[PDB]
Write a protein that holds these residues in place. Structure first.
Motif, mmCIF file in Angstrom:
data_model
loop_
_atom_site.group_PDB
_atom_site.id
_atom_site.type_symbol
_atom_site.label_atom_id
_atom_site.label_comp_id
_atom_site.label_asym_id
_atom_site.label_seq_id
_atom_site.Cartn_x
_atom_site.Cartn_y
_atom_site.Cartn_z
ATOM 1 N N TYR A 1 0.930 -1.720 -0.452
ATOM 2 C CA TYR A 1 0.118 0.302 -0.024
ATOM 3 C C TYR A 1 1.133 1.615 0.274
ATOM 4 O O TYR A 1 1.311 1.213 0.591
ATOM 5 C CB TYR A 1 -1.112 0.262 0.585
ATOM 6 C CG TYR A 1 -1.658 1.209 1.279
ATOM 7 C CD1 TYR A 1 -2.991 1.553 0.443
ATOM 8 C CD2 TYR A 1 -1.777 2.348 2.267
ATOM 9 C CE1 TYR A 1 -3.720 2.804 0.250
ATOM 10 C CE2 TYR A 1 -2.894 3.001 2.155
ATOM 11 C CZ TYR A 1 -3.029 3.716 1.322
ATOM 12 O OH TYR A 1 -4.494 4.323 1.234
ATOM 13 N N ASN A 2 1.069 1.907 -1.258
ATOM 14 C CA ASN A 2 1.685 3.702 -0.772
ATOM 15 C C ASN A 2 0.447 4.104 -0.513
ATOM 16 O O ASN A 2 -0.739 4.513 -0.972
ATOM 17 C CB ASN A 2 1.540 3.583 -2.269
ATOM 18 C CG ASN A 2 2.278 5.080 -2.337
ATOM 19 O OD1 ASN A 2 2.611 5.360 -1.318
ATOM 20 N ND2 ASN A 2 2.434 5.287 -3.609
ATOM 21 N N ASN A 3 0.970 5.351 0.542
ATOM 22 C CA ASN A 3 0.373 5.994 1.409
ATOM 23 C C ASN A 3 0.003 7.257 1.138
ATOM 24 O O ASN A 3 0.615 8.536 0.523
ATOM 25 C CB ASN A 3 1.246 6.596 3.518
ATOM 26 C CG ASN A 3 -0.046 6.891 3.808
ATOM 27 O OD1 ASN A 3 -1.319 7.559 3.852
ATOM 28 N ND2 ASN A 3 0.058 7.920 5.048
ATOM 29 N N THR A 4 -0.941 7.613 -0.235
ATOM 30 C CA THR A 4 -1.758 8.640 -0.587
ATOM 31 C C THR A 4 -3.225 8.770 -0.428
ATOM 32 O O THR A 4 -3.653 9.382 -0.799
ATOM 33 C CB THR A 4 -1.693 7.757 -2.476
ATOM 34 O OG1 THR A 4 -2.765 7.044 -2.409
ATOM 35 C CG2 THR A 4 -0.556 7.595 -2.990
ATOM 36 N N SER A 5 -3.239 8.659 1.058
ATOM 37 C CA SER A 5 -4.269 9.875 1.908
ATOM 38 C C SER A 5 -4.117 11.395 2.081
ATOM 39 O O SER A 5 -5.012 11.680 2.189
ATOM 40 C CB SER A 5 -4.371 8.311 2.856
ATOM 41 O OG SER A 5 -4.101 9.213 3.947
ATOM 42 N N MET B 1 3.384 10.155 5.353
ATOM 43 C CA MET B 1 3.046 10.487 3.788
ATOM 44 C C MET B 1 3.570 9.929 2.515
ATOM 45 O O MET B 1 5.105 9.877 3.209
ATOM 46 C CB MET B 1 2.840 11.551 3.431
ATOM 47 C CG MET B 1 1.690 12.490 4.401
ATOM 48 S SD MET B 1 1.231 13.798 3.996
ATOM 49 C CE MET B 1 1.265 14.613 5.970
ATOM 50 N N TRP B 2 3.238 9.427 1.677
ATOM 51 C CA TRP B 2 4.294 9.173 0.068
ATOM 52 C C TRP B 2 4.812 7.224 0.900
ATOM 53 O O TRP B 2 6.120 7.496 -0.204
ATOM 54 C CB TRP B 2 5.238 10.241 -0.532
ATOM 55 C CG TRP B 2 3.493 11.698 -0.439
ATOM 56 C CD1 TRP B 2 4.081 12.492 -0.233
ATOM 57 C CD2 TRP B 2 2.542 11.682 -0.862
ATOM 58 N NE1 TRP B 2 2.868 13.550 0.174
ATOM 59 C CE2 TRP B 2 2.283 12.834 -0.124
ATOM 60 C CE3 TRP B 2 1.977 10.559 -1.411
ATOM 61 C CZ2 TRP B 2 0.831 13.163 -0.597
ATOM 62 C CZ3 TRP B 2 0.935 11.447 -2.003
ATOM 63 C CH2 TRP B 2 -0.183 12.634 -1.900
ATOM 64 N N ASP B 3 5.095 6.284 1.282
ATOM 65 C CA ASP B 3 5.408 5.983 1.823
ATOM 66 C C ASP B 3 5.003 4.539 1.652
ATOM 67 O O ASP B 3 3.695 4.321 1.535
ATOM 68 C CB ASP B 3 6.198 6.080 3.459
ATOM 69 C CG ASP B 3 7.254 5.361 3.905
ATOM 70 O OD1 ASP B 3 7.603 4.610 2.795
ATOM 71 O OD2 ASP B 3 7.443 4.912 4.670
ATOM 72 N N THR B 4 5.409 3.393 1.651
ATOM 73 C CA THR B 4 5.216 2.467 0.711
ATOM 74 C C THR B 4 5.012 0.927 2.403
ATOM 75 O O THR B 4 6.211 1.188 2.639
ATOM 76 C CB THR B 4 4.959 1.449 -0.189
ATOM 77 O OG1 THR B 4 5.485 2.768 -1.015
ATOM 78 C CG2 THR B 4 4.788 0.546 -0.964
ATOM 79 N N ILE B 5 4.302 0.186 2.181
ATOM 80 C CA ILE B 5 4.520 -0.956 3.356
ATOM 81 C C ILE B 5 4.291 -2.152 3.103
ATOM 82 O O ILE B 5 3.490 -2.040 1.588
ATOM 83 C CB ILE B 5 3.280 -0.655 4.446
ATOM 84 C CG1 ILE B 5 3.796 -2.213 5.744
ATOM 85 C CG2 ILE B 5 1.658 -0.512 4.360
ATOM 86 C CD1 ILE B 5 3.101 -1.960 6.881
HETATM 87 C C1 LIG Z 1 3.779 6.524 -4.380
HETATM 88 O O1 LIG Z 1 2.961 7.253 -3.869
HETATM 89 C C2 LIG Z 1 3.177 9.065 -4.991
HETATM 90 C C3 LIG Z 1 2.641 10.250 -5.246
HETATM 91 O O2 LIG Z 1 0.677 9.514 -5.540
HETATM 92 C C4 LIG Z 1 5.066 8.230 -5.810
HETATM 93 O O3 LIG Z 1 5.552 9.970 -5.602
HETATM 94 C C5 LIG Z 1 5.644 7.447 -4.839
HETATM 95 O O4 LIG Z 1 7.266 7.176 -6.321
HETATM 96 C C6 LIG Z 1 4.854 6.151 -4.995
HETATM 97 N N1 LIG Z 1 5.584 5.183 -4.107
HETATM 98 C C7 LIG Z 1 6.332 4.151 -5.207
HETATM 99 C C8 LIG Z 1 7.117 3.079 -4.011
HETATM 100 O O5 LIG Z 1 6.016 3.838 -6.379
#
Ligand SMILES: *[C@@H]1O[C@H](CO)[C@@H](O)[C@H](O)[C@H]1NC(C)=O
Ligand SMILES: *[C@@H]1O[C@H](CO)[C@@H](O)[C@H](O)[C@H]1NC(C)=O
Ligand SMILES: *[C@@H]1O[C@H](CO)[C@@H](O)[C@H](O)[C@H]1NC(C)=O
Ligand SMILES: *[C@@H]1O[C@H](CO)[C@@H](O)[C@H](O)[C@H]1NC(C)=O
Ligand SMILES: *[C@@H]1O[C@H](CO)[C@@H](O)[C@H](O)[C@H]1NC(C)=O
Ligand SMILES: *[C@@H]1O[C@H](CO)[C@@H](O)[C@H](O)[C@H]1NC(C)=O
Ligand SMILES: *[C@@H]1O[C@H](CO)[C@@H](O)[C@H](O)[C@H]1NC(C)=O
Ligand SMILES: *[C@@H]1O[C@H](CO)[C@@H](O)[C@H](O)[C@H]1NC(C)=O
Ligand SMILES: *[C@@H]1O[C@H](CO)[C@@H](O)[C@H](O)[C@H]1NC(C)=O
Ligand SMILES: *[C@@H]1O[C@H](CO)[C@@H](O)[C@H](O)[C@H]1NC(C)=O
Ligand SMILES: *[C@@H]1O[C@H](CO)[C@@H](O)[C@H](O)[C@H]1NC(C)=O
Ligand SMILES: *[C@@H]1O[C@H](CO)[C@@H](O)[C@H](O)[C@H]1NC(C)=O
Lengths: 490, 490, 490
Positions: B163-167, B234-238
């Motif tokens: 999940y990419n934190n785009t909230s 924010m904008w981090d992945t788990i």
């Molecule tokens: C997560 O989303 C942001 C913007 O929505 C983006 O810049 C970022 O690269 C994304 N993360 C990954 C691991 O792709």
């Protein structure tokens, strides 16, 4: 005829400190700081302490063979421990949450050792292992409260053991894990490689794996032993399971009595005496609100200050110089029955006297002041002392800074309070003397003549009864109006 | 002709305490301590609190089936929790860093639930697990916010999810690990032995292995579930990866609003008010520097003291008894217009008066004193209250000792300040009366005769204008100088 | 012929604050709070600080290639660091017990770097690894104080190493463990799967296992490096053993000089100046007991408060308005010799004078009060400032609360002290003037006539010698009694 008003002086050499002056001699004073002790370690409220000697808490609980005098220990008031105990873990190793265990022991006053897992129940393992580090009379031995499990023949079956806490209180249980030096030792002692030690209660779940690696030799061995502890609640069960490297408990410590206690770091020995307050240097027998013996204390004891002197002024200021004048020239050495008083010189002799109401009021005020300063301080049971590990330096610094800040705050409070109160009582005495002089002047009016030294010269002939009336505030001005008028105009 | 100087008395019964005397009756007094509350739990600044009921924080966040009313909660001001909640973890287990999570919740005022991992995306596993511990209407169920993954057919493939934190805000995510009881349960649930659960973020790296052992039965099961939580920026992945024993989240909590809040331990039920300071006993409506209701408060509340009485004297000492005498014999009960005044008696009547300048100065001084006492105390939104585990007793003791030390420091400060200031005021009033008498005497000089009871007998005839002048301060000595000399000599 | 008693007035506009009234103009005052600073970062006691620049502590200790200037750092007094340094861990990862290391660095003033494990002893491994994250001039590189061990050909033998601390002091040693992203990377680098890293000392025993999982890409890599540190005692040995994933150290840091230092968070640069107190905003050059520049200071610095004004009154109240009258109407602008004095007007001339005894007594009283207030405050060295991680929020809150509480307590103490002592000083001056007037009246008795404004009018004729006797205190009443009685009656 003549009447004078003055105050009392004596040969006292006691000095106090005020905010405006230093080294002011006073007639009386009260010390509110205790600086003495007996230099002995005594019994607290009739119960002797627990003298560990050269042993440590871990060595006592585990059953070090050199601490065999502590197999059965009666009730205690506090624990005496050396700074660097010698007989601790004879087998090299560690002890997880040691400081937490000591803090728990800081509020426990008695233990009861209960056999929770008899040594003979291990009928499928060898339970007579030993080491040369914990040697008795040359022959190898081991801890007296723990069992070392070793293979029987060439087989190490799964070791299982359980205990249901039906004793009546919380129980403290200690177990251990063995870390060998090489694979040969592991295979010679346990016959299998890849073992585990599993301990589990209703709220605890731990699994450990032995670590085999060459290490620097401590006490002649490259092996180690890791010990852990838990608190078993009432009507709760503890389970043990291991394929190897398990040191099993044989006894469990039940908490029989509870209260306020502590661990005192000292190198002394208990002596036959009794006390209600104990410090690492000696006991304190005092009834004052401050002391400066030692910060660490056990029992109901006064607050600790970094002050070398705290004296409250109670009497007047000593300025004894002195017909005979009044309060203006100085105090009197002949008035030995009160603080403020009179002096008369008439036809029927002379003599001193002492006013009663003013002295009583001043005495009551001073007593109320000193009692208010003393009793406004809260005293409870303080056993301030805590141990922190080498990886808990920030917490230790936090604790130290907290204690230092509180000590500084209370030192400032006491010092400023005494300094201001001494000045106020010194001014209070002079105000009282001046008020008495003004009262006498107003009661006498024009029938007398002022002299500038606190003395009045009468125009009429005032006998002893008239002087008594003057001292008692029952002077009849009309009775002497005509008489005093004649001489005044002439 | 007589003009007397005195002060005001009334029928008050209020008493204050000074450092020299106790229980001194005063005409006027001010209380700076509030001891009353309405005994009701109710709204803070228009925002109702979050009433958990019998649910714990862990049960609410995980989605316990007995707490379905909390599946969508609005804004809140503070959290109401019971001391020993009943509906928490229905499945027996543990929660990691629970107290840190609660402390974080102490500064959050709203949550928004976001579906980050839908339950239907696990197309290669079984996502309909349940247990009898969490049962609704008899049928087995599970936590409503988490997914239990089980083998499909006879295969458990490697499970992956991200999940990419785009909230737009920080998000809280909770996952769990299952610890079975025996190997048979592990094989029938996951088909594999020796599994792992890996969770990783930019600043997190955690891998866990299930532990299989026999444990005492809690809620009828020998198995355990261990839960962990993280804060995703924010904008981090788990990333999730597991070969078995994984309880996966379905929802995430993003911090919609931040502020000041707290957790209050009460057994009561929300009622209706609109208050600004809340205690576990009730609300407070105060405008005073101190209170003694409860230590733990939420909102802006006065400093808490272990004092039962703190009263400041703002008036004169009440001596009731007073031809008409002066301040020597006591106060007047007929002068109802001020503190210090006069009393004249000529052929044209006899009445009381009141000096305005002295009374105004004393009033301003007393008001400034009380405002200085009240307004130097700093008040701020404080949310005191913290939680510690069974293995953090030293930290808990440190916190408790710090709070107690500060409490006693402030108690001593307040009590001593009031005790001293009362004496200062009671001496101030007497000094003011003395100064008024001295000024009148000095400006009147020889034309009058003192009487010793506080007033003066005039040698000439003083009409109303002359009394008005002597009260005014523009008494003309040369005007009556020749007349006064005539009757003085006779 | 007349003589007056009055006090001193001037043209000053200084203002002080009391407890009964505000905005009082005084002749003299003393400021005991500094509000100014240099605005520069300087050398503490001649020793320059350590300017980390855009580097962190981890970057300096590990040897980040960008931080190549900090390889032979000399002795320092304090460390300058940025809030968010740019050059830290070039290879992504973590640092265990980072805050403990930073705390330990606050008591170390010099490090000596000694080579403990040269890079050429690893004859069975490849020691030239690198990464594009830590790249210099495009070509890959690595940390300068660490060695990356990889396979030589297709073999990774057991890597063993040891070091005995014969340097002469405690040593700081840092090692690391590599966590790859996939099994292919692990096989490419170390050829083995299921490796371990073992580190052991006399009091330490650690074992680590690499973690292989997919992680979000930080600095372009999905792999991490976990670093740990230890403190090796004198005459002690540290043992390294690994089958893979070991980042062995090459240098050890010897604590050459220990003292009291700190870490200051600033974005500034060092400038050429000397100081004894340093704050993140500038340097303090004072003798005053208080300041309000910044809570965090390094050196011998005054106590910090939240006050905007702290002025002590050391003079009289400026009420300038004046035949010449006395102290009833106001002060004198022409008596510039002292504080209290006389004005005489006879046939031989007129002028002003001063009383040296009373002025001296008041002067030493005020000086003693000021010295008592200033000197009772205890000062010492305290490099306030600590760091906490994201999982230690409760501890950080505890530290912040304790610091804020102590600051509030000291602010309250100082403010109340200043107010009460200002009030008492003003009352002291008034009482001294009144006492002088009363003394003169008492000594002069009936030979003079009072006027009500602080002046006496002689009935006889008083020359310069008689005036000097009156000021001296040796006025002969009988010598003028016969003559004075004649003029008074007529
Ligand atoms: C997560 O989303 C942001 C913007 O929505 C983006 O810049 C970022 O690269 C994304 N993360 C990954 C691991 O792709
Ligand atoms: C007060 O007395 C002490 C010893 O009793 C002495 O050390 C100190 O100097 C004295 N102070 C003054 C001002 O004389
Ligand atoms: C332990 O003993 C208590 C009291 O005898 C009993 O209630 C409990 O069930 C026992 N524990 C087990 C696991 O049987
Ligand atoms: C302690 O002091 C008290 C005085 O109040 C005395 O009666 C008592 O005997 C003393 N006890 C000891 C052990 O010195
Ligand atoms: C005071 O003492 C005198 C002694 O002569 C006595 O006559 C008088 O009654 C006393 N007055 C009071 C109020 O005790
Ligand atoms: C003061 O009065 C209170 C009750 O009004 C009483 O409890 C207390 O004992 C009194 N104190 C004294 C010293 O009389
Ligand atoms: C009292 O003094 C004031 C001075 O402001 C004056 O105006 C007024 O007339 C005076 N009153 C009398 C009765 O003298
Ligand atoms: C006050 O008078 C002094 C003369 O001693 C002068 O130097 C100073 O400037 C004056 N200050 C004001 C504000 O008039
Ligand atoms: C006291 O003087 C200051 C000037 O520094 C002024 O700002 C303040 O308002 C004055 N106090 C009052 C109560 O006006
Ligand atoms: C380390 O060196 C000291 C002397 O410098 C020596 O006594 C000690 O035995 C050495 N350590 C080992 C493990 O040999
Ligand atoms: C610091 O203050 C002293 C005061 O004695 C002064 O001599 C010195 O020049 C000052 N130094 C700086 C850098 O301000
Ligand atoms: C004043 O007193 C001093 C004492 O120091 C004495 O020397 C001088 O003669 C006196 N002068 C007069 C006029 O009394």
């Amino acid at each position: 005829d003549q009447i004078c008003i003055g105050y009392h002086a004596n040969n006292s050499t006691e000095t106090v400190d005020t905010i405006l002056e230093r080294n002011v001699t006073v007639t009386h004073a009260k010390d509110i700081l205790e600086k003495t002790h007996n230099g002995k370690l005594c019994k607290l409220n009739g119960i002797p302490p627990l003298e560990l000697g050269d042993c440590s808490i871990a060595g006592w609980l585990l059953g070090n063979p050199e601490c065999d005098r502590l197999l059965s220990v009666p009730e205690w008031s506090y624990i005496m421990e050396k700074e660097n105990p010698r007989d601790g873990l004879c087998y090299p190793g560690s002890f997880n949450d040691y400081e937490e265990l000591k803090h728990l022991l800081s509020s426990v006053k008695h233990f009861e050792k209960v056999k929770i897992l008899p040594k003979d129940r291990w009928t499928q393992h060898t339970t007579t292992g030993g080491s040369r580090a914990c040697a008795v009379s040359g022959e190898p031995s081991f801890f007296r409260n723990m069992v070392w499990l070793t293979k029987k023949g060439s087989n190490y079956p799964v070791a299982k053991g359980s205990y249901n806490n039906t004793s009546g209180e919380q129980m403290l249980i200690i177990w251990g894990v063995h870390h060998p030096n090489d694979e040969t030792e592991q295979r010679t002692l346990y016959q299998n490689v890849g073992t585990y030690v599993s301990v589990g209660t209703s709220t605890l779940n731990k699994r450990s794996t032995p670590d085999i690696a060459t290490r620097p030799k401590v006490n002649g061995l490259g092996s180690r032993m890791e010990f852990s502890w838990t608190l078993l609640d009432m009507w709760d069960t503890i389970n043990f399971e291991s394929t190897g490297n398990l040191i099993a408990p044989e006894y469990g410590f039940k908490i029989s009595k509870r209260g306020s206690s502590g661990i005192m770091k000292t190198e002394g020995t208990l002596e036959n005496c009794e006390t209600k307050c104990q410090t690492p240097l000696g006991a304190i027998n005092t009834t004052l609100p401050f002391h400066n013996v030692h910060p660490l204390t056990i029992g109901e004891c006064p607050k600790y200050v970094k002050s070398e002197k705290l004296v409250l002024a109670t009497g007047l200021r000593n300025v004894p110089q002195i017909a005979i004048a009044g309060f203006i020239e100085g105090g009197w050495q002949g008035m030995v029955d009160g603080w403020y008083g009179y002096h008369h010189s008439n036809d029927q002799g002379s003599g001193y006297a002492a006013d009663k109401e003013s002295t009583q009021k001043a005495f009551d005020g001073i007593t109320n002041k000193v009692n208010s300063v003393i009793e406004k301080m809260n005293t409870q049971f303080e056993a301030v002392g805590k141990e922190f590990s080498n990886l808990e330096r920030r917490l230790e610094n936090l604790n130290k800074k907290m204690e230092d800040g509180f000590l500084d705050v209370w030192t400032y409070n006491a010092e400023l309070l005494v300094l201001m109160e001494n000045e106020r009582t010194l001014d209070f005495h002079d105000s009282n003397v001046k008020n008495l002089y003004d009262k006498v002047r107003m009661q006498l009016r024009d029938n007398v003549k002022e002299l500038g030294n606190g003395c009045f010269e009468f125009y009429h002939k005032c006998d002893d009864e008239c002087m008594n009336s003057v001292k008692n505030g029952t002077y009849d001005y009309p009775k002497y109006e005509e008489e005093s008028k004649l001489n005044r105009n002439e």
